[PDB]
Design a protein around this ligand. Structure first.
Ligand code: ATP
Ligand code: ATP
Lengths: 324, 129, 92, 115, 91, 333
């Protein structure tokens, strides 16, 4: 029919497909959920993420047998940024270690860093609810909570991640292979006003970008503006996982020398690429964002995950990061 | 991952009887309610090591309702001197039902792991103090 | 069955004293292993666990943590899929 | 990650001076205010003498007090050191000048300054 | 001499104005703790050089990776010198 | 004047010397006193003990500005002993980690593992008092605390080891040169009934003999009795600084292999040696013990620092708070 028109109908099915699935559907037939007592100490909590190789845990409070919100790397990004750029005392930050998840969220909850109550959905409700729930605030990943009627106690059932939503799609949708309109032709991704850093930027400056730009990552480039690396906000967990908060004064550089070898790639694509492949990459490798680069890995733009997901889902101190 | 890894229930050592004793006392001071050994009238048998406990779900209590957690506890010898206090939820039940309601039919609605774990936890703190 | 409050009268007396009461059952083979006992690569979930079994559904499983916290967990069905929640709670 | 005098400082001196008073306000400390000398203010302003309700004495009895001299120095541009100095214990009625309470009061100052 | 009330000018907004007496400069003699001295367990790793008598009872702090405060101070006990170094609870 | 008699006159001179000095006098001319908040978590307390390469620390209670006792490895041998034999769950000591030093030493308070008040002495009181204190009270080092009359607060000045104290002597008393009366003649140091583990002996059992024989170390021999090593309670710190208490189920074997290279020695000597040489090993190395052994490295007895000091420190009398009871706990190391 038309390269343009076959995306249209593709999207129309991708959208139609999403709605007809429940969040519940994306879950594997048998998975594992790690959940943290909101009373846990910050330190302990941070270790936990590390040796369990996760970036997030749902808090449980219990006392309520109610859900206490979603602990994510944005939690430390927001407080760290707050402490920089307010205070005057550079080691004030280290108090973050007295804190318990409660106390922490409490502080976050008293600077703007967390909306009044955390965010939604029921597992058997439409997958769309999930996207829309994320879409309407980065929130990047969302708990699926039900309630044990017999007890009135909430039952955290899992956490849905933009990436797992997309990979579950790349997998159940023939239609992804008919999304072949070049990007330079679509309105997706950001392509001007890019926030970037150099190996010499202080990590805390990056951190300061991530929150106020509400972003989970920042592309790193040399003078010629060649893409070298990224700095994610998970790369922050690794910086303070042992309680060294002065570790935050390192240039992005020295701080990347720490980065352990687990790290999912840094993905690139050309402006003349298209979703069909970007989905195929999703299908196999853990993408997070893709950067758009020119023939000399010069950064043209940033296509991100929410970017994509939103694009699918409808076609009709200032201030905080969302999730991770 | 270094043999500080997952195993069922709670490891135990020393003497079976002494353990049971701990467990009751643990239960006891937890505020649970348990099943007590019954002999065939010469004296006891294995199943004295199979306790059933009723637990008042703390949050349920504290805001009116009278809902219960049912926890069965088994003790196994693994090798001599060595035991596994095997814990095990077998349900939550408010004494009817709610103020109205009971839509059912397929296949018997939510059994969550809570408050089961939360008091599994509460137990463990008693067994360790 | 039929419950409660007081700790049995014997047991409390003091009870090394022969009596040679019943020993507990021995450990059955299915209780010999948790699925939480690991994994598999190909992402996409380091969160996927093997299909649990039926019989070892709702039991308590524990792990020590070097971090002054408790590691509790149990497996349950949710509709027709199985959630193994694992909790890192605090002490008292 | 190791030992240095006083408490490090970012920004613009007089903010800091303000922050200090503030944390100095909410620990219960009294303190000197700045001394304007003619057309106003001296660098002597970055030099608070403070007076301190010992806790343990104004607990079981004793009207006993405690003095700390706070001083702000610059080390580089935008970088200062709040040097804190014990100078007294006087029960408001040679011979050991213990580092305590002084340190605990230091502990409080610090705690104040960091929230 | 002893007020209880933050000076007016320091307080509110556009505190960024009329003047700027600066703080003095960090004297050389600060800037070095007697506590960053002998790495080695020569008999006591407890054993330290002599402090400068002027920078006697002064606060010195250090980062800990353990969510606690590390506070220190050298005092003269009789004719010898304790450099106490407390690890206090953050609170 | 005779060997037997030169010692007599020697010890007397040493004695008087000891009485002519105040505990203060043993302190370096400038040092570093590390202190802990009673309220600190046990876990931190270990990491901090270890970081700062030390094995004890005065506890401090700001609240009241008072000495809160002296954290020691014994504290840990002590509750640690207590759990293993009085509790049917292995894991579940683990909890230790959770406790603050307060909660910890109140458990010791609770099981009779620490006496009501703690023994301390005025820095400016005679050294002799500190050696008696420590002898009477079986404690292997004792805090020195004065009183700030103005504030009424307790100023910890230091803590004396028995080691430091002997080394004080050995540096200051020419008179040690004159102690040439072999051991086997002198009635001193235990020579019979010796607690000793093998390298297959479980790490908690050793912990067990420690508390209960109230000793700081236990020599590790092997079938034919040859001194191999010593397990010390300060070896526990390393055992659980990691926060891994499963580490207590290691044979002494394995736990030994974890021992970082900073260990002081094992000091052996011959049953026929003599305080003069002992006193000057002390002067050079850091001896915590002497395993009196024979031609063939077969253990014969155990001369100890307390042994020494105490012996260097009584002419006619003993001070019988010696011992106090059976199957107790552990003094302070
Ligand atoms: N360095 C940057 N400068 C400007 N805009 C950016 C930058 N990084 C991401 N963006 C844009 O911000 C939006 C956020 O994307 P998303 O909700 O997936 O979370 P994100 O963290 O912002 O994306 P990413 O995972 O790429 O960091 C996207 O539209 C993306 O185009
Ligand atoms: N392994 C052992 N077996 C039997 N008795 C011992 C053993 N170790 C020490 N003793 C005896 O008990 C006391 C042990 O000395 P102490 O209780 O002071 O511990 P220590 O290891 O000997 O250290 P110190 O040198 O400080 O005395 C001594 O009086 C000694 O004679």
């Amino acid at each position: 029919m038309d390269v343009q028109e076959t995306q249209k109908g593709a999207l129309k099915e991708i959208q139609a497909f999403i709605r007809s699935r429940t969040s519940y559907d994306v879950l594997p037939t048998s998975f594992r959920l790690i959940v943290f007592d909101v009373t846990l100490f910050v330190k302990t909590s941070l270790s936990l993420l590390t040796l369990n190789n996760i970036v997030s845990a749902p808090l449980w409070d219990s006392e309520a047998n109610k859900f206490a919100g979603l602990l994510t790397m944005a939690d430390f990004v927001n407080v760290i940024k707050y402490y920089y750029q307010s205070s005057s005392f550079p080691e004030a930050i280290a108090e973050i270690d007295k804190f318990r998840l409660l106390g922490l969220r409490e502080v976050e909850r008293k600077i703007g860093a967390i909306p009044p109550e955390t965010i939604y959905v029921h597992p058997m409700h439409s997958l769309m609810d999930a996207c829309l729930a994320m879409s309407k605030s980065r929130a990047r990943r969302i708990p699926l909570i039900d309630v044990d009627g017999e007890t009135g106690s909430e039952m955290i059932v899992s956490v849905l991640t933009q990436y797992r939503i997309l990979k579950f799609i790349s997998m159940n949708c023939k239609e992804t292979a008919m999304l072949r309109v070049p990007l330079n032709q679509m309105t997706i991704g950001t392509w001007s006003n890019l926030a970037t850093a150099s190996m010499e930027t202080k990590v805390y400056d990056v951190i300061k970008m991530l929150a106020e730009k509400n972003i989970s990552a920042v592309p790193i480039v040399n003078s010629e503006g060649t893409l070298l690396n990224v700095y994610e906000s998970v790369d922050v967990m690794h910086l303070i996982q042992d309680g060294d908060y002065s570790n935050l004064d390192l240039s992005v550089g020295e701080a990347l020398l720490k980065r352990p070898a687990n790290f999912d790639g840094v993905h690139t694509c050309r402006a003349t690429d298209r979703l069909d492949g970007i989905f195929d990459a999703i299908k196999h490798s853990r993408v997070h964002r893709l950067f758009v680069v020119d023939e000399n890995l010069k950064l043209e733009g940033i296509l991100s995950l929410a970017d994509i997901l939103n694009y699918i889902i409808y076609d009709k101190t200032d201030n905080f990061e969302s999730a991770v | 991952s270094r043999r500080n890894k997952w195993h069922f229930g709670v490891r135990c050592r020393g003497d079976a009887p002494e353990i049971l004793l701990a467990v009751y006392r643990a239960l006891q001071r937890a505020g649970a309610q348990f099943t007590v050994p019954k002999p065939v009238n010469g004296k006891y048998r294995s199943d004295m090591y199979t306790i059933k406990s009723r637990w008042e779900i703390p949050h349920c209590k504290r805001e009116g309702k009278n809902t219960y957690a049912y926890i069965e506890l088994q003790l196994y010898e693994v090798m001599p001197g060595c035991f596994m206090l095997d814990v095990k939820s077998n349900g939550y039940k408010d004494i009817y039902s709610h103020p109205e309601r009971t839509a059912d039919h397929g296949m018997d609605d939510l059994k969550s792991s809570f408050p089961f774990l939360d008091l599994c936890a509460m137990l463990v703190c008693k067994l360790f103090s | 069955e039929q419950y409660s409050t007081e700790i049995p009268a014997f047991l409390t007396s003091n009870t090394l004293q022969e009596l040679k009461l019943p020993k507990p059952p021995s450990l059955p083979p299915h209780l010999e292993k948790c699925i939480l006992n690991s994994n598999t690569a190909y992402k996409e979930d380091q969160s996927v666990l093997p299909n649990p079994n039926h019989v070892l559904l709702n039991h308590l499983a524990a792990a020590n943590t070097q971090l002054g916290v408790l590691a509790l967990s149990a497996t349950t069905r949710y509709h027709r899929k199985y959630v193994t929640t694992a909790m890192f709670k605090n002490f008292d």
